[PDB]
Design an enzyme around this catalytic site. Sequence first.
Site, PDB file in Angstrom:
ATOM      1  N   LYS A  31       0.824  -1.203   0.000  1.00  0.00           N
ATOM      2  CA  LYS A  31       0.000   0.000   0.000  1.00  0.00           C
ATOM      3  C   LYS A  31       0.862   1.258   0.000  1.00  0.00           C
ATOM      4  CE  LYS A  31      -3.402  -2.698  -0.021  1.00  0.00           C
ATOM      5  NZ  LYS A  31      -4.174  -2.887  -1.280  1.00  0.00           N
ATOM      6  N   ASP A  50      -7.933  10.001  -7.342  1.00  0.00           N
ATOM      7  CA  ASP A  50      -9.094   9.182  -7.016  1.00  0.00           C
ATOM      8  C   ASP A  50      -8.730   8.074  -6.034  1.00  0.00           C
ATOM      9  OD1 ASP A  50     -12.044   8.413  -7.915  1.00  0.00           O
ATOM     10  OD2 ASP A  50     -10.978   6.550  -7.884  1.00  0.00           O
ATOM     11  N   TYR A  55      -9.415   0.914  -0.897  1.00  0.00           N
ATOM     12  CA  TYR A  55      -8.084   0.766  -1.472  1.00  0.00           C
ATOM     13  C   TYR A  55      -7.027   0.614  -0.385  1.00  0.00           C
ATOM     14  CZ  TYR A  55     -10.504   2.525  -5.613  1.00  0.00           C
ATOM     15  OH  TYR A  55     -11.387   2.704  -6.654  1.00  0.00           O
ATOM     16  N   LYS A  84     -14.528   7.379  -1.298  1.00  0.00           N
ATOM     17  CA  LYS A  84     -15.767   6.604  -1.555  1.00  0.00           C
ATOM     18  C   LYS A  84     -16.164   5.812  -0.309  1.00  0.00           C
ATOM     19  CE  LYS A  84     -14.225   5.760  -6.321  1.00  0.00           C
ATOM     20  NZ  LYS A  84     -12.730   5.563  -6.116  1.00  0.00           N
ATOM     21  N   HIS A 117     -19.687   3.948  -3.319  1.00  0.00           N
ATOM     22  CA  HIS A 117     -18.807   3.108  -4.178  1.00  0.00           C
ATOM     23  C   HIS A 117     -19.559   2.079  -5.054  1.00  0.00           C
ATOM     24  CE1 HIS A 117     -14.408   1.435  -4.434  1.00  0.00           C
ATOM     25  NE2 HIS A 117     -15.069   1.196  -5.549  1.00  0.00           N
ATOM     26  N   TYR A 216     -13.382   4.812 -15.304  1.00  0.00           N
ATOM     27  CA  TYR A 216     -12.282   3.922 -15.000  1.00  0.00           C
ATOM     28  C   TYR A 216     -12.192   2.808 -16.051  1.00  0.00           C
ATOM     29  CZ  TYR A 216     -15.514   0.632 -12.593  1.00  0.00           C
ATOM     30  OH  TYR A 216     -16.506  -0.242 -12.261  1.00  0.00           O
ATOM     31  N   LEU A 219      -7.853   2.310 -19.862  1.00  0.00           N
ATOM     32  CA  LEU A 219      -6.784   1.635 -20.598  1.00  0.00           C
ATOM     33  C   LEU A 219      -6.927   0.113 -20.487  1.00  0.00           C
ATOM     34  CD1 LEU A 219      -3.791   3.984 -19.619  1.00  0.00           C
ATOM     35  CD2 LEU A 219      -5.357   4.223 -21.640  1.00  0.00           C
ATOM     36  N   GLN A 222      -6.271  -2.610 -14.608  1.00  0.00           N
ATOM     37  CA  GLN A 222      -5.029  -3.233 -14.140  1.00  0.00           C
ATOM     38  C   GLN A 222      -5.155  -4.774 -14.137  1.00  0.00           C
ATOM     39  OE1 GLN A 222      -2.459  -0.559 -11.493  1.00  0.00           O
ATOM     40  NE2 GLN A 222      -4.474  -0.097 -10.599  1.00  0.00           N
ATOM     41  N   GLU A 274       7.038   5.714 -14.081  1.00  0.00           N
ATOM     42  CA  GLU A 274       7.190   7.161 -14.112  1.00  0.00           C
ATOM     43  C   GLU A 274       7.106   7.750 -15.514  1.00  0.00           C
ATOM     44  OE1 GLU A 274      10.526   8.679 -12.066  1.00  0.00           O
ATOM     45  OE2 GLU A 274       9.889  10.754 -12.439  1.00  0.00           O
ATOM     46  N   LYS A 278       4.233  10.559 -17.006  1.00  0.00           N
ATOM     47  CA  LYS A 278       4.478  11.788 -17.750  1.00  0.00           C
ATOM     48  C   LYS A 278       3.854  11.724 -19.140  1.00  0.00           C
ATOM     49  CE  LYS A 278       8.930  12.729 -15.541  1.00  0.00           C
ATOM     50  NZ  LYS A 278      10.390  12.440 -15.559  1.00  0.00           N
TER      51      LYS A 278
END
Length: 323
Positions: A31, A50, A55, A84, A117, A216, A219, A222, A274, A278
């Site tokens: 975490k 967010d 989490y 949330k 949530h 969410y 992409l 995860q 990282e 960016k």
Amino acid sequence: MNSKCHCVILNDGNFIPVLGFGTALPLECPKSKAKELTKIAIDAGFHHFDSASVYNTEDHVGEAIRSKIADGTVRREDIFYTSKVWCTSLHPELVRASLERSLQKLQFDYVDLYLIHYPMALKPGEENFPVDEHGKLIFDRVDLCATWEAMEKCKDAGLTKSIGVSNFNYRQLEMILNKPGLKYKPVCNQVECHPYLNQMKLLDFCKSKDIVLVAYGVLGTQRYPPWVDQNSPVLLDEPVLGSMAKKYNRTPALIALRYQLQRGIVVLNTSLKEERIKENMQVFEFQLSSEDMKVLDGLNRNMRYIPAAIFKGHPNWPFLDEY
Ligand SMILES: NC(=O)c1ccc[n+]([C@@H]2O[C@H](COP(=O)([O-])OP(=O)(O)OC[C@H]3O[C@@H](n4cnc5c(N)ncnc54)[C@H](OP(=O)(O)O)[C@@H]3O)[C@@H](O)[C@H]2O)c1
Ligand SMILES: CC[C@H](c1ccc(O)cc1)[C@@H](CC)c1ccc(O)cc1
């Protein structure tokens, strides 16, 4: 919040940033990895973050934000932080206690945004996923309109600037909107949304009611192995996104991010790297054409990466209705 930001305006007058960094991790991570990532995200120009009670990264993100204040990078006023209330604290008498606990973890006076949530309640207690001896979640019953009044009193008490909802369908949003004595509409509905699952009908509806859709899975998620069928296609491997990336001289991920911004959606994203963090800021740098937008609309295949299957037996399960 500086009205100068790449922001939209919520229906209670407050400014959001359109790009947010998500602070849910991969399940293998400490975490405490959230602190490192938040500092990097700040440095790259993110000011909307967010999170969620569930989490367990709230204390770590708050600490990152406090150091970036201490050292002159940001002010509290220019950070937009979301939390949330989880499924175990939906009972009206439990909502404010949960917010105040999060505020204590964060060492914050207020959050900017506070969401229900899920529209589904579970057995109260410290454990987030209470199950029976067969490995099934222990559901509970709640009045969501009464959960909502408690959200309203949190706003009147100054503990949160804004309120709304997450993973609600059309009918569940309608329940709140039509509620007798309604004081504040939800400012947003946070839901999964990408190329593959474009939420056109849910989005159209939210706009008509002054509700911002926050996305969410932008992409492809995860792919948390608890929650995501590991045989689902990997969104960023889509040949249409790779070929469009070549056309615009940008990346598949940048195409997916931009598609949503031009639809009036607020977008979340997470990376562990990282350089990718960016890179994602380059979303403000280019425009997708009207016809390329239509080409991306064509990817829609009702691929839901996060159907929250373990909740599938719940009466308030949001994903059965068409939208
Ligand atoms: N309300 C809800 O129910 C809910 C549910 C799920 C998540 N969320 C929120 O949404 C946030 C986003 O999480 P998500 O699970 O939906 O994931 P996502 O934003 O769809 O990200 C998916 C993957 O994209 C990769 N990625 C990021 N930038 C990239 C780039 N430039 N090039 C290539 N790959 C890139 C990341 O991998 P690498 O780390 O390897 O770069 C990441 O694992 C969470 O942190 C959380 O705040 C909310
Ligand atoms: C969003 C990521 C998360 C999750 C959260 C909300 C969901 O509707 C589904 C999955 C998983 C399960 C808790 C997770 C893992 C680690 C973490 O730090 C946060 C969330």
